[PDB]
Amino acid sequence: GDRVADVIESSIGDSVSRALTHALPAPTGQNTQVSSHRLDTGKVPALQAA
Amino acid sequence: SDRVAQLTIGNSTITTQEAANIIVGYGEWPSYCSDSDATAVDKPTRPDVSVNRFYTLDTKLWEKSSKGWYWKFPDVLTETGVFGQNAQFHYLYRSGFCIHVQCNASKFHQGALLVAVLPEYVIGTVAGGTGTEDTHPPYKQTQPGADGFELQHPYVLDAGIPISQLTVCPHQWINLRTNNCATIIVPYINALPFDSALNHCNFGLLVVPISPLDYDQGATPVIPITITLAPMCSEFAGLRQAVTQ
């Protein structure tokens, strides 16, 4: 009998693969959408950290 | 109704009294490019007045021993106006054209021209005359400018093809008894939605007299031929520094 608590809450016996991602379809390349000019702060896609 | 006509695009305007109907090359009008056909992602520019107006090139002369001429479009306008000063900056180009031709004369003169529009009119040399000597046409015969270039062998149009079959293209005549001008409208003819304006030359205008000019003494001998034309639905893309050639 599993009467202790550290055995009930245990993560042992996990046959599942936690996947962050998930596949999607792509029969064609992506359709470029329209854009216009923006002059805002905070928003800044160019600056990355590699 | 069919004789009188007027042509107003841009700041400019044309009148004419003894004309004929207007032609639309290959049965359709100009247009801007679709979002499906197009491939480039950059947003074009579309001035709509500074470029889409009548430019006047140069005024030739028509003697009795004249043979013909041609002009390559849109090479004619690469040094003329805000049109040309955009076509040097950018790399990609799209446009249509309206083309109006002038030649006046009295009711004692006689003659006939043929005003045709041929896409991809490659020029071919004479192979030295013997046939063996391979040659190529120089730069001033393929992009001669706005001053035009004169034909040497017009029966074959300098490309091994007769002039007898040039009417299958968009053509008009100027029979001096009947009319005094020819108006031709043309869409953008190319396999690619955009293409350069400096290297590529999409079509060539031809003006060949079939029945020669003739008159009697005491009459005005100078019979000029003037060429007028207007871009339409002009787009540009790929901005960068100016490139003459």
Side-chain angles (χ1 to χ4, degrees):
Chain A
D2 295 332
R3 298 293 298 163
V4 299
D6 58 358
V7 170
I8 297 164
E9 300 182 356
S10 66
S11 68
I12 295 169
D14 190 0
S15 65
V16 174
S17 66
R18 291 180 285 168
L20 301 168
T21 67
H22 65 284
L24 295 175
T28 65
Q30 188 178 4
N31 293 328
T32 297
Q33 296 294 110
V34 186
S35 67
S36 298
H37 66 281
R38 190 177 61 244
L39 298 169
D40 290 328
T41 62
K43 297 181 178 68
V44 59
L47 297 171
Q48 298 293 322
Chain B
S1 180
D2 186 75
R3 304 288 287 163
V4 176
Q6 184 176 1
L7 301 171
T8 296
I9 192 170
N11 60 8
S12 66
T13 298
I14 290 173
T15 59
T16 186
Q17 287 174 356
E18 297 181 356
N21 201 357
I22 296 166
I23 293 288
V24 184
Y26 293 108
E28 68 185 2
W29 294 86
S31 67
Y32 293 99
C33 187
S34 66
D35 293 329
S36 63
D37 294 332
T39 186
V41 303
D42 59 354
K43 193 181 283 183
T45 192
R46 300 185 174 99
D48 198 7
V49 289
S50 66
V51 297
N52 295 320
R53 62 182 297 282
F54 285 103
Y55 293 104
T56 302
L57 272 62
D58 190 74
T59 311
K60 297 287 185 180
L61 296 174
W62 182 31
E63 299 179 353
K64 297 179 182 179
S65 64
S66 293
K67 292 187 286 188
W69 293 274
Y70 61 88
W71 292 265
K72 297 295 183 73
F73 287 68
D75 174 13
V76 286
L77 300 165
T78 54
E79 295 181 353
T80 301
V82 179
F83 180 84
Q85 291 293 322
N86 283 315
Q88 297 179 3
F89 295 158
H90 295 98
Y91 169 64
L92 293 172
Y93 172 74
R94 179 165 180 163
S95 70
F97 284 95
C98 186
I99 299 161
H100 193 73
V101 178
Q102 294 87 10
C103 184
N104 60 3
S106 72
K107 300 182 185 289
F108 290 2
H109 296 75
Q110 73 190 1
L113 292 172
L114 178 60
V115 180
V117 170
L118 182 61
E120 298 296 336
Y121 174 55
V122 182
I123 301 294
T125 63
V126 298
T130 64
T132 60
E133 186 179 0
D134 182 74
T135 62
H136 296 286
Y139 181 73
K140 65 184 181 294
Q141 296 183 358
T142 64
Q143 294 179 0
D147 295 330
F149 184 75
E150 183 173 1
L151 296 173
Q152 292 181 357
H153 294 90
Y155 186 71
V156 293
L157 300 176
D158 296 333
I161 51 169
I163 192 165
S164 65
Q165 300 175 7
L166 190 68
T167 68
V168 70
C169 301
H171 67 281
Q172 277 193 353
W173 298 81
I174 296 168
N175 191 355
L176 295 175
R177 69 175 291 160
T178 301
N179 61 359
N180 64 15
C181 66
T183 303
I184 297 159
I185 297 163
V186 183
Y188 185 70
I189 293 164
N190 188 359
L192 300 172
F194 293 91
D195 192 359
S196 178
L198 298 169
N199 299 116
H200 196 195
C201 299
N202 285 317
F203 63 91
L205 187 74
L206 289 88
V207 178
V208 183
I210 307 295
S211 177
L213 183 65
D214 191 1
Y215 59 81
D216 286 333
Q217 295 292 319
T220 302
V222 180
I223 305 298
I225 293 170
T226 305
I227 299 294
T228 304
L229 59 91
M232 281 192 290
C233 288
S234 293
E235 298 181 354
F236 296 99
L239 200 84
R240 36 87 174 150
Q241 70 250 24
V243 173
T244 58
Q245 63 180 358

PDB file of all heavy atoms in Angstrom, chain A residues 32 35, chain B residues 41 43:
ATOM      1  N   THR A  32       3.192  36.987 -47.454  1.00  0.00           N
ATOM      2  CA  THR A  32       3.591  38.257 -46.879  1.00  0.00           C
ATOM      3  C   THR A  32       2.394  39.195 -46.785  1.00  0.00           C
ATOM      4  O   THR A  32       1.712  39.449 -47.781  1.00  0.00           O
ATOM      5  CB  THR A  32       4.693  38.879 -47.722  1.00  0.00           C
ATOM      6  OG1 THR A  32       5.844  38.030 -47.706  1.00  0.00           O
ATOM      7  CG2 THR A  32       5.057  40.224 -47.193  1.00  0.00           C
ATOM      8  N   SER A  35       2.146  46.059 -44.343  1.00  0.00           N
ATOM      9  CA  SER A  35       2.577  46.811 -43.179  1.00  0.00           C
ATOM     10  C   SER A  35       2.705  48.279 -43.534  1.00  0.00           C
ATOM     11  O   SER A  35       2.662  48.673 -44.701  1.00  0.00           O
ATOM     12  CB  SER A  35       3.909  46.309 -42.636  1.00  0.00           C
ATOM     13  OG  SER A  35       4.951  46.571 -43.548  1.00  0.00           O
TER      14      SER A  35
ATOM     15  N   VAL B  41       8.188  41.959 -52.241  1.00  0.00           N
ATOM     16  CA  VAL B  41       7.464  42.313 -51.031  1.00  0.00           C
ATOM     17  C   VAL B  41       7.471  43.811 -50.757  1.00  0.00           C
ATOM     18  O   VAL B  41       6.584  44.302 -50.045  1.00  0.00           O
ATOM     19  CB  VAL B  41       8.028  41.552 -49.815  1.00  0.00           C
ATOM     20  CG1 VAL B  41       7.977  40.073 -50.050  1.00  0.00           C
ATOM     21  CG2 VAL B  41       9.433  41.969 -49.497  1.00  0.00           C
ATOM     22  N   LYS B  43       6.997  47.792 -50.908  1.00  0.00           N
ATOM     23  CA  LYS B  43       5.871  48.594 -51.335  1.00  0.00           C
ATOM     24  C   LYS B  43       6.315  49.507 -52.470  1.00  0.00           C
ATOM     25  O   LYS B  43       7.266  50.273 -52.289  1.00  0.00           O
ATOM     26  CB  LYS B  43       5.349  49.408 -50.168  1.00  0.00           C
ATOM     27  CG  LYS B  43       4.006  50.045 -50.393  1.00  0.00           C
ATOM     28  CD  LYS B  43       3.562  50.854 -49.207  1.00  0.00           C
ATOM     29  CE  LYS B  43       3.059  49.970 -48.110  1.00  0.00           C
ATOM     30  NZ  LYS B  43       2.549  50.734 -46.973  1.00  0.00           N
TER      31      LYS B  43
END
